Amino acid sequence: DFVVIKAVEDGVNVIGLTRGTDTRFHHSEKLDKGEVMICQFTEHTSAIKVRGEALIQTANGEMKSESK
Amino acid sequence: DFVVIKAVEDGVNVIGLTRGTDTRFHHSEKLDKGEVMICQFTEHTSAIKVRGEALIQTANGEMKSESK
Amino acid sequence: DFVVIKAVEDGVNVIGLTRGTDTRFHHSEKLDKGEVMICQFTEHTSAIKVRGEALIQTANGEMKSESK
Amino acid sequence: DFVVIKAVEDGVNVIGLTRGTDTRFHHSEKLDKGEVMICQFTEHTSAIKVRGEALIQTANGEMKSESK
Amino acid sequence: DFVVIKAVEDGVNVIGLTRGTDTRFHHSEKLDKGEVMICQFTEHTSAIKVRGEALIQTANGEMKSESK
Amino acid sequence: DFVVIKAVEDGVNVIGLTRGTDTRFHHSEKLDKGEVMICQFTEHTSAIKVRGEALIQTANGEMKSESK
Amino acid sequence: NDFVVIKAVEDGVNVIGLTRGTDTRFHHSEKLDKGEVMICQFTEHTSAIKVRGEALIQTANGEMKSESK
Amino acid sequence: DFVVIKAVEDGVNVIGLTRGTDTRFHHSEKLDKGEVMICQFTEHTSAIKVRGEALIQTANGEMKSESK
Amino acid sequence: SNDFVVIKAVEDGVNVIGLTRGTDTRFHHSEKLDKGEVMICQFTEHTSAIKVRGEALIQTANGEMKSESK
Amino acid sequence: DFVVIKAVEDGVNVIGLTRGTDTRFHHSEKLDKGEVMICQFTEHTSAIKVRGEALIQTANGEMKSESK
Amino acid sequence: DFVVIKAVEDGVNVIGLTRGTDTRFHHSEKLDKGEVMICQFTEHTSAIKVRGEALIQTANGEMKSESK
Numbered sequence: 001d002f003v004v005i006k007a008v009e010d011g012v013n014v015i016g017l018t019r020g021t022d023t024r025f026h027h028s029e030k031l032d033k034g035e036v037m038i039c040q041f042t043e044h045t046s047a048i049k050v051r052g053e054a055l056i057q058t059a060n061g062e063m064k065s066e067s068k
Numbered sequence: 069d070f071v072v073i074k075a076v077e078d079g080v081n082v083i084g085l086t087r088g089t090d091t092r093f094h095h096s097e098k099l100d101k102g103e104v105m106i107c108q109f110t111e112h113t114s115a116i117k118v119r120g121e122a123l124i125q126t127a128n129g130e131m132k133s134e135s136k
Numbered sequence: 137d138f139v140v141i142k143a144v145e146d147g148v149n150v151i152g153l154t155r156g157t158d159t160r161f162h163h164s165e166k167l168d169k170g171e172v173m174i175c176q177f178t179e180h181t182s183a184i185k186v187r188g189e190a191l192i193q194t195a196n197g198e199m200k201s202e203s204k
Numbered sequence: 205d206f207v208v209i210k211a212v213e214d215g216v217n218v219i220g221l222t223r224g225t226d227t228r229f230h231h232s233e234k235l236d237k238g239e240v241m242i243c244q245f246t247e248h249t250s251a252i253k254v255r256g257e258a259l260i261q262t263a264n265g266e267m268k269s270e271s272k
Numbered sequence: 273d274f275v276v277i278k279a280v281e282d283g284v285n286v287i288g289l290t291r292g293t294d295t296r297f298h299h300s301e302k303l304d305k306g307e308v309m310i311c312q313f314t315e316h317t318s319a320i321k322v323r324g325e326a327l328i329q330t331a332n333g334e335m336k337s338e339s340k
Numbered sequence: 341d342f343v344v345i346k347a348v349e350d351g352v353n354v355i356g357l358t359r360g361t362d363t364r365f366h367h368s369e370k371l372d373k374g375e376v377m378i379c380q381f382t383e384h385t386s387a388i389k390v391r392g393e394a395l396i397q398t399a400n401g402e403m404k405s406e407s408k
Numbered sequence: 409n410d411f412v413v414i415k416a417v418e419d420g421v422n423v424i425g426l427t428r429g430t431d432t433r434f435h436h437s438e439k440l441d442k443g444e445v446m447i448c449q450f451t452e453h454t455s456a457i458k459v460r461g462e463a464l465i466q467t468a469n470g471e472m473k474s475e476s477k
Numbered sequence: 478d479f480v481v482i483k484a485v486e487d488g489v490n491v492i493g494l495t496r497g498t499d500t501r502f503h504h505s506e507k508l509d510k511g512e513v514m515i516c517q518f519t520e521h522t523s524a525i526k527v528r529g530e531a532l533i534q535t536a537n538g539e540m541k542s543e544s545k
Numbered sequence: 546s547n548d549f550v551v552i553k554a555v556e557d558g559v560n561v562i563g564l565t566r567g568t569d570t571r572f573h574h575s576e577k578l579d580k581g582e583v584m585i586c587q588f589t590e591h592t593s594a595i596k597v598r599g600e601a602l603i604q605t606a607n608g609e610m611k612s613e614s615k
Numbered sequence: 616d617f618v619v620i621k622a623v624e625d626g627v628n629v630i631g632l633t634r635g636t637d638t639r640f641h642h643s644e645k646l647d648k649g650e651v652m653i654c655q656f657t658e659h660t661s662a663i664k665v666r667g668e669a670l671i672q673t674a675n676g677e678m679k680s681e682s683k
Numbered sequence: 684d685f686v687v688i689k690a691v692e693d694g695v696n697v698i699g700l701t702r703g704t705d706t707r708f709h710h711s712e713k714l715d716k717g718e719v720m721i722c723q724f725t726e727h728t729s730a731i732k733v734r735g736e737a738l739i740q741t742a743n744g745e746m747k748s749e750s751k
């Protein structure tokens with residue numbers, strides 16, 4: 001399973017959270033206005049956090065996030 | 069199987085429950101207004117609880133969380 | 137294979153019965169009004185009982201549970 | 205797979221029958237009005253029986269069991 | 273795969289036939305009016321026979337067994 | 341995969357043919373009017389023949405046979 | 409392993425099975441009389457099926473008919 | 478996967494092609510008007526060719542072949 | 546579930562070419578199809594790419610396609 | 616999965632990129648007006664580049680490339 | 684799983700982020716206007732980033748990227 005993320009505005013952050021007993025930030029990808037990121041769930045990433053104004057697509061539909 | 073969760077307002081709390089014989093929360097991710105989280109059921113998480121005002125998506129359809 | 141449970145009122149319990157020759161209650165997750173709980177069937181949970189008023193989602197459609 | 209059972213009246217019984225060369229009632233889960241039970245077919249259970257007024261959801265469709 | 277059976281009238285027989293070289297009924301399960309039986313194909317049951325007035329659901333459609 | 345067979349009148353025979361090098365009948369299941377049979381293909385049965393007036397359902401739809 | 413449904417609309421329908429392997433040849437012909445229905449699988453021994461006679465045929469790939477001769 | 482081939486006329490040829498480094502026909506099944514042939518791809522058959530006026534069916538839909 | 550291709554030759558002179566799987570890529574066989582003949586073939590341990598020349602009707606799980614000659 | 620590429624003009628090139636740590640072209644297949652190439656992702660090809668004017672069909676829909 | 688990317692502007696940038704504990708780009712493939720790149724997630728690429736104006740296709744539908 002993967003998630004699609006389009007940055008509608010500057011400052012969007014695609015954060016990865018560690019898989020396992022411990023849960024913490026292990027990476028944050030900065031997406032500029034109009035950039036798109038397609039990312040999977042991996043051995044290392046069992047959860048993903050999105051901040052900023054962005055369009056999101058998953059196998060389970062579409063979603064929106066806003067800044068501030 | 070993954071769950072998508074949108075924080076409609078501040079105070080949304082995404083909680084993970086341990087897999088196996090015992091059942092406790094091992095993690096709580098708090099989302100601010102607009103932040104989106106996408107998490108899987110995993111080796112360590114077999115049940116998930118959503119607290120606060122949130123939009124929720126699973127393979128089984130959409131659902132809304134209510135705070136208080 | 138998961139079940140989604142939104143509690144329509146306070147005092148809602150999501151009970152888990154054990155897998156194996158024996159069938160007994162091993163845990164009860166209390167849900168306050170508006171709280172949503174997504175949970176799986178597991179090596180330890182092979183059946184689930186929902187007591188109280190709530191909205192239920194499975195791959196096999198939707199169901200509602202009434203309080204006493 | 206799994207079967208969803210919603211007791212529409214008090215005294216709805218959900219019996220588990222043993223898998224294997226022997227066929228026996230190995231457990232009886234009593235359901236009262238409103239309560240909902242989602243249960244699987246397992247190593248130990250290959251056939252399920254339902255007595256009482258209840259709503260039933262499987263993959264093959266919906267079904268109803270009468271009381272008396 | 274599983275078969276959903278609901279007895280329309282009393283004394284319905286759900287007959288399991290043996291998997292393997294030979295073919296005899298290893299079991300007969302009586303369902304009373306309004307009761308519902310859900311049973312799988314198993315290591316021991318490769319054929320099932322319904323005798324009496326009952327409603328039948330499988331993945332391949334719906335069918336009715338008749339009294340006399 | 342399995343076959344569903346309803347006897348439209350007395351004298352319906354569900355015949356199983358041996359899987360493997362040989363091809364002979366190893367069992368005939370006599371179905372009376374109104375009865376329903378649900379059989380799989382198996383390590384012992386790789387071909388099934390129906391004789392008499394019956395309604396049949398498979399994952400490929402429905403089909404009827406006529407007697408005499 | 410997909411199967412084939414066959415109903416004989418008339419008398420003298422043959423359901424032939426051809427051997428699986430490097431050699432291809434008939435190993436069995438099942439006679440179906442009018443109205444009879446046969447449902448057969450593809451097996452270790454049978455990789456090809458031949459239908460002779462007027463019959464109705466059902467596979468995962470749709471419906472088909474056959475005529476005598 | 479399997480092919481379904483119906484001869485619309487006499488002179489229909491169902492040709493089997495060899496799996497492996499080499500590619501040549503190892504069998505030619507001759508079909509007369511009205512006859513139907515269903516055949517799989519196999520350890521020995523990784524391609525099939527149809528000659529003659531025939532009606533063909535595959536998972537990718539239908540197709541007619543013309544003789545000459 | 547090992548995918549396959551369906552190819553019907555609209556006119557004569559149709560070639561169904563098979564390219565090799567592995568480090569290298571070359572034609573290891575060309576099947577000539579003539580007007581009206583149909584060919585269904587799989588990708589395999591030896592065939593991972595297929596090139597079609599001439600005028601034909603093509604069918605795959607991803608839809609339909611036509612090819613022209615010249 | 617696999618890709619269908621239909622050359623709409625002369626000078627169509629279908630390029631395969633290497634799978635593994637290193638990413639580089641390992642082949643380029645020319646296509647002339649009218650020709651159709653059908654190709655798989657493989658052990659050696661994990662990325663595919665299409666240059667020129669062509670029609671493209673994937674499991675994720677159609678797409679048209681242009682030349683110049 | 685694979686991603687389809689058509690460039691609507693010269694110098695489009697398709698970036699592959701490394702699979703594993705560390706997340707950095709191991710490759711940047713350029714696409715000029717009209718060119719199409721079809722690529723997979725691999726043992727080495729667990730996340731993809733698109734920079735520049737382009738059409739993007741995935742199993743989860745369509746998405747556009749904008750440059751600047």
Ligand SMILES: N[C@@H](Cc1c[nH]c2ccccc12)C(=O)O
Pocket residue numbers: 014015016017027028029039040041042043044045048700701702703704705706707729730
């Ligand atoms: N190196 C990361 C790449 C990754 C995938 N999904 C992500 C989500 C957020 C941040 C990084 C990622 C991994 O393989 O796990």
Ligand SMILES: N[C@@H](Cc1c[nH]c2ccccc12)C(=O)O
Pocket residue numbers: 017018019020021022023024046047082083084085095096097107108109110111112113116
């Ligand atoms: N470390 C947790 C991360 C996690 C995934 N899904 C979750 C849901 C809620 C809380 C934490 C999580 C895990 O891999 O299991």
Ligand SMILES: N[C@@H](Cc1c[nH]c2ccccc12)C(=O)O
Pocket residue numbers: 085086087088089090091092114115150151152153163164165175176177178179180181184
């Ligand atoms: N620790 C429990 C968590 C659980 C999953 N599903 C449930 C249903 C009810 C109660 C608890 C649960 C388990 O892994 O099985």
Ligand SMILES: N[C@@H](Cc1c[nH]c2ccccc12)C(=O)O
Pocket residue numbers: 153154155156157158159160182183218219220221231232233243244245246247248249252
């Ligand atoms: N311990 C039983 C619980 C069970 C599952 N499904 C059931 C249906 C009816 C009664 C009991 C059950 C089991 O794992 O098999």
Ligand SMILES: N[C@@H](Cc1c[nH]c2ccccc12)C(=O)O
Pocket residue numbers: 221222223224225226227228250251286287288289299300301311312313314315316317320
């Ligand atoms: N012990 C039997 C119980 C059973 C399952 N499905 C059935 C259908 C009919 C009769 C009995 C059964 C079995 O596991 O096979």
Ligand SMILES: N[C@@H](Cc1c[nH]c2ccccc12)C(=O)O
Pocket residue numbers: 289290291292293294295318319354355356357367368369379380381382383384385388
């Ligand atoms: N003993 C038989 C039972 C059976 C299954 N399907 C059938 C069809 C016809 C006759 C018998 C059967 C078997 O396991 O193979």
Ligand SMILES: N[C@@H](Cc1c[nH]c2ccccc12)C(=O)O
Pocket residue numbers: 357358359360361362363364386387423424425426436437438448449450451452453454457
């Ligand atoms: N003994 C045969 C039964 C069979 C299956 N499919 C058939 C088609 C035609 C004739 C016989 C059959 C076999 O296993 O192969």
Ligand SMILES: N[C@@H](Cc1c[nH]c2ccccc12)C(=O)O
Pocket residue numbers: 426427428429430431432433455456491492493494504505506516517518519520521522525
């Ligand atoms: N022995 C051949 C029979 C066969 C199957 N499919 C075919 C298609 C064409 C010709 C022959 C065949 C094989 O298994 O491969």
Ligand SMILES: N[C@@H](Cc1c[nH]c2ccccc12)C(=O)O
Pocket residue numbers: 494495496497498499500501523524561562563564574575576586587588589590591592595
């Ligand atoms: N012997 C070839 C047969 C083949 C299958 N598909 C093809 C496409 C083109 C040419 C030959 C073929 C192979 O197994 O690979």
Ligand SMILES: N[C@@H](Cc1c[nH]c2ccccc12)C(=O)O
Pocket residue numbers: 564565566567568569570593594629630631632642643644654655656657658659660663
């Ligand atoms: N030898 C190459 C053939 C190939 C398959 N798909 C392709 C796409 C483009 C170029 C070449 C190819 C391979 O096995 O991988």
Ligand SMILES: N[C@@H](Cc1c[nH]c2ccccc12)C(=O)O
Pocket residue numbers: 632633634635636637638639661662697698699710711712722723724725726727728731
């Ligand atoms: N060698 C790379 C090729 C690749 C696949 N998908 C990509 C996406 C972007 C950049 C490169 C790639 C790999 O297999 O992973």
